[PDB]
Amino acid sequence: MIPIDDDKLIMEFKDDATAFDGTKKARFKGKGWLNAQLSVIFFKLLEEHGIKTHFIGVAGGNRLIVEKLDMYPLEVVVRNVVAGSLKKRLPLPEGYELPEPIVELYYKNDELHDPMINYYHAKVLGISLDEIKKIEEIALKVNEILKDYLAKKGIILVDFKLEFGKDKNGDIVLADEISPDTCRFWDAKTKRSLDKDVFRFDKGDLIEAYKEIYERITGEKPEF
Ligand X SMILES: Cc1cn([C@H]2C[C@H](O)[C@@H](COP(=O)(O)OP(=O)(O)O)O2)c(=O)[nH]c1=O
Which spans of this chain sit near a copy of itself (rule: CB under 8 A)?
88-92, 98-105, 107, 109, 111-112, 115-118, 120-121, 123-125
| Nearest-angstrom CA–CA distance, 146 and 180 | 13
Q: 3-class DSSP state for residue 138?
A: helix
- Closer Cβ to ligand X, 43 or 106, answer by number: 106
Task: Write down the least CB distance from residue 207 to a copy of itself, Å.
Answer: 34
Cα(211)–Cα(176) distance, integer angstroms: 21
User: CB of 131: closest distance to ligand X in angstroms?
Assistant: 20
Start-end of H helices in the chain? 31-48, 119-124, 129-151, 197-200, 206-218
Which of positions 58-117 make contact with ligand X (CB under 6 A)?
75, 77, 84-86, 106, 114
State yes or no: residue 184 binds ligand X (CB under 6 A). Answer: yes
> Between the CA of residue 13 and those of 145, 166, 170, 188, what are the distances in Å?
24, 22, 27, 28
Q: Quick check: 106 and 115 in contact, CB under 8 A?
A: yes
Residue 107 burial (CB count, 10 A)? 18
Interruptions in the chain after residues (C–N over 2.5 Å): none
Q: Binding mask 111-150 vs ligand X (x if CB under 6 A, - otherwise)?
A: ---x------------------------------------
Instruction: Identify what 161 binds: a copy of itself, ligand X, none; CB under 5 to 8 Å per kind.
Output: ligand X
Residue 139 C-beta: closest distance to ligand X, Å: 11
User: Applying CB under 6 A, what is the total number of residues that bind ligand X?
Assistant: 13
Site residues, ligand X (CB under 6 A): 75, 77, 84-86, 106, 114, 159-161, 182-184
